[PDB]
Amino acid sequence: PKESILKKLEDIKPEQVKKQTKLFRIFEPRQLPVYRANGEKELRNRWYWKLKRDTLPDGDYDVREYFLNLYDQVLTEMPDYLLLKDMAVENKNSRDAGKVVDSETAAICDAIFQDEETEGVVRRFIAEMRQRVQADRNVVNYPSILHPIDHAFNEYFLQHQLVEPLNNDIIFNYIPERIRNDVNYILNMDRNLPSTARYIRPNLLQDRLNLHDNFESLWDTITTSNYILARSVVPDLKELVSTEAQIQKMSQDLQLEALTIQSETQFLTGINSQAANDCFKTLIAAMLSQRTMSLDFVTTNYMSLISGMWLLTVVPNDMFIRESLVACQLAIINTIIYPAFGMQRMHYRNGDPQTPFQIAEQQIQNFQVANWLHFVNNNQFRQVVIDGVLNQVLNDNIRNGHVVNQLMEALMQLSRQQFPTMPVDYKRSIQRGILLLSNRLGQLVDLTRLLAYNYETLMACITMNMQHVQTLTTEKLQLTSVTSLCMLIGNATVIPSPQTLFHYYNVNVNFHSNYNERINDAVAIITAANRLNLYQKKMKSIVEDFLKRLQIFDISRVPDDQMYRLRDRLRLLPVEIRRLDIFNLILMNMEQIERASDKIAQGVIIAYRDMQLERDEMYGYVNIARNLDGFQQINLEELMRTGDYAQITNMLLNNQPVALVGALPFITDSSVISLVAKLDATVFAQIVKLRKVDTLKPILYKINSDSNDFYLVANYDWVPTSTTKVYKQIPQQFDFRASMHMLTSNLTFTVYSDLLAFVSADTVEPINAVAFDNMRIMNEL
Amino acid sequence: SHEDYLIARELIVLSYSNRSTLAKLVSSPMSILVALVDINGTFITNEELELEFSNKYVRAIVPDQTFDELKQM
Structure with missing residues (x-):
């Protein structure tokens, strides 16, 4: 439950560095025939660009879904670096025994070298294409054969690959400035790293979402996670004073009945260790995570009320929750302070805007206590940005502990008073209770300095900005765990080891990097869905993925409303450069991909006019059209949202020219007898009876000598005329030379993921351990 | 429990003959398991x-x- 959360955090592996083995390709060459004009067939054939994996659906919405999925695929392939030599291969026909980048490039080059029907120029070009190196720069240049879109993607992955030269200085600069400038730590390393090396930098950009603005259920989990993580790095109090050698001193100071030890006259309750460490840990982890902590005490126990002073001084009051410290301040005022000057008990109100210390600061007239209470009331954090991260810092008087001297001033005054309204036993009890703290004065000073030092030291190892906001759930703090700490402490300094610091810092780095990376993912898909007009898409499962990849939440019990608000915030975030460019390489070429794919067609023209067929050459004569100009067009996805087959039905019954637009299948018919019979005009009657338009499959009239009735064309002097052309483009022709490119890359670098393993770190002997003021801590005796 | 039955059936039938090299055996790996x-x-x-x-x-x-x-x- 608790241990599980830290198991989840510390099992966040970093982002695994990517490196591709092949090249992104969508297209491939393919031999088709070539049909000379008049239709008949050459002995020679020819290469054309075709698509790998024709899988485009029917309908435009489904095609835009296809391109979103392709965008996701390309992102998943989107690498972080690459070395082209690792994919390079030989060329079996190169003059110089050279190489080429990809295996498929070589397959192409070795199939075109063999064909009868290739010029000698291309074979020469293949013999002369090879690798090159220039080692002074550690650069290599390999050949490649690539469709222009493929070259665009590959070249982008080249020019925009995320690495940074690694050296021995960046290792230091990766550490916070505070640790390097803290004299209590000594650092070194046993290796020099070359300039051949590399390293990837995390994305540590602060919260783009403001989850501290009305996502309290999520912020509770985040803050709890950081609290429990911080508990795992606060040091244990290795050495104290014994728990029985103290209580006898306390008892003789109090002059108690024998064998009251097992009754624990309320001064002596919960003095043990296992609470002092608990308080020491809780306070620091709460201030680090900025998690509110509530107080469960008792009023019979006056030592708890006395030790609450040290707490309410060293710790801000806006850090607690209101009713708890209201109760505690009220108690202190009513039974330590106002009875010491003959004041009335008090008259406090439950829903009162002011806290008891405020309304007491002005009533009583004593300098010491008044100014102490002034400090308490106006104690608060100081925001300050350091090393990029916001930080909540203490006063610089709490740190070099002198607040405790104001406290002692107040307490000594209260010792010096009399309690006229009240009996002698009461005064005696209180004054002994505060002498037990007076006698621990120097240790209190040392404790304050030690907490402040460890707090700032661990603050140094924080990446996400640390906001001061109250929370739903709190953390209990029994004041017996304060009294213990204030009473079980001495001559025992504890400095967090550097390894704990590095661990905590890398943990926070990895969480922050994961957070930013997944944000960028979700923002990319949301923006892409909105720019591809995907309107039926309910944007929830994406946010479920976003929260699942953040390994601390429970999506099983988070509603849809938080998800949609989170989506509304994610809409307004800029996409990073990589993803945006990869998407804009698709918006400008998704159509050119969609003009290909001989499984769909971009429309069908219906013009009751005996129109001519086109002299293409991968086909012969076809009923093809490539502009869609003239005739008025009707989009079918509109027709399939709002079924209104009134317009189209009117137009079909009246034989009116029209065009129909949308990804349509088609079926080829290489029968000339299907041309003069005019079967393509027979297809649109099912649109008037069963008003659906899904089983709509126009005809393509590819005619050639391979058609078994072609002889008519070559005997009768008739150009194939026809009706109801199809809106479709032709394949492109494969130019080997123009398809060739040279891909650059770096030669033989080495990528180092972890960055502090090369750092060895040590602490000075904690007796001679020092704080910000160049003045020893744990020195009072 | 079932695993208790397995352990007991597997020691009772083997402790009838081996009486010098049994507890030394099964009790030995434990020193390593704690280190895992x-x-x-x-x-x-x-x-x-x-x-x-x-x-x-x-x-x-x-x-x-x-x-x-x-x-x-």
Whole structure:
């Protein structure tokens, strides 16, 4: 439950560095025939660009879904670096025994070298294409054969690959400035790293979402996670004073009945260790995570009320929750302070805007206590940005502990008073209770300095900005765990080891990097869905993925409303450069991909006019059209949202020219007898009876000598005329030379993921351990 | 329980003959197993029964040859 959360955090592996083995390709060459004009067939054939994996659906919405999925695929392939030599291969026909980048490039080059029907120029070009190196720069240049879109993607992955030269200085600069400038730590390393090396930098950009603005259920989990993580790095109090050698001193100071030890006259309750460490840990982890902590005490126990002073001084009051410290301040005022000057008990109100210390600061007239209470009331954090991260810092008087001297001033005054309204036993009890703290004065000073030092030291190892906001759930703090700490402490300094610091810092780095990376993912898909007009898409499962990849939440019990608000915030975030460019390489070429794919067609023209067929050459004569100009067009996805087959039905019954637009299948018919019979005009009657338009499959009239009735064309002097052309483009022709490119890359670098393993770190002997003021801590005796 | 039955049936039938090399055997791997369990939460000592728990996490950096030892065992 608790241990599980830290198991989840510390099992966040970093982002695994990517490196591709092949090249992104969508297209491939393919031999088709070539049909000379008049239709008949050459002995020679020819290469054309075709698509790998024709899988485009029917309908435009489904095609835009296809391109979103392709965008996701390309992102998943989107690498972080690459070395082209690792994919390079030989060329079996190169003059110089050279190489080429990809295996498929070589397959192409070795199939075109063999064909009868290739010029000698291309074979020469293949013999002369090879690798090159220039080692002074550690650069290599390999050949490649690539469709222009493929070259665009590959070249982008080249020019925009995320690495940074690694050296021995960046290792230091990766550490916070505070640790390097803290004299209590000594650092070194046993290796020099070359300039051949590399390293990837995390994305540590602060919260783009403001989850501290009305996502309290999520912020509770985040803050709890950081609290429990911080508990795992606060040091244990290795050495104290014994728990029985103290209580006898306390008892003789109090002059108690024998064998009251097992009754624990309320001064002596919960003095043990296992609470002092608990308080020491809780306070620091709460201030680090900025998690509110509530107080469960008792009023019979006056030592708890006395030790609450040290707490309410060293710790801000806006850090607690209101009713708890209201109760505690009220108690202190009513039974330590106002009875010491003959004041009335008090008259406090439950829903009162002011806290008891405020309304007491002005009533009583004593300098010491008044100014102490002034400090308490106006104690608060100081925001300050350091090393990029916001930080909540203490006063610089709490740190070099002198607040405790104001406290002692107040307490000594209260010792010096009399309690006229009240009996002698009461005064005696209180004054002994505060002498037990007076006698621990120097240790209190040392404790304050030690907490402040460890707090700032661990603050140094924080990446996400640390906001001061109250929370739903709190953390209990029994004041017996304060009294213990204030009473079980001495001559025992504890400095967090550097390894704990590095661990905590890398943990926070990895969480922050994961957070930013997944944000960028979700923002990319949301923006892409909105720019591809995907309107039926309910944007929830994406946010479920976003929260699942953040390994601390429970999506099983988070509603849809938080998800949609989170989506509304994610809409307004800029996409990073990589993803945006990869998407804009698709918006400008998704159509050119969609003009290909001989499984769909971009429309069908219906013009009751005996129109001519086109002299293409991968086909012969076809009923093809490539502009869609003239005739008025009707989009079918509109027709399939709002079924209104009134317009189209009117137009079909009246034989009116029209065009129909949308990804349509088609079926080829290489029968000339299907041309003069005019079967393509027979297809649109099912649109008037069963008003659906899904089983709509126009005809393509590819005619050639391979058609078994072609002889008519070559005997009768008739150009194939026809009706109801199809809106479709032709394949492109494969130019080997123009398809060739040279891909650059770096030669033989080495990528180092972890960055502090090369750092060895040590602490000075904690007796001679020092704080910000160049003045020893744990020195009072 | 079932595993209790397995253990008991597997010792009662073998303790009828082996009487010198049995408890030494099954009790030996344990010394290694303790060196394989990651800490998530700890207890501490100060003075003869004092405790002060720690939420400290600690992994288990076990070498490879002790696995071979355990396998031989």
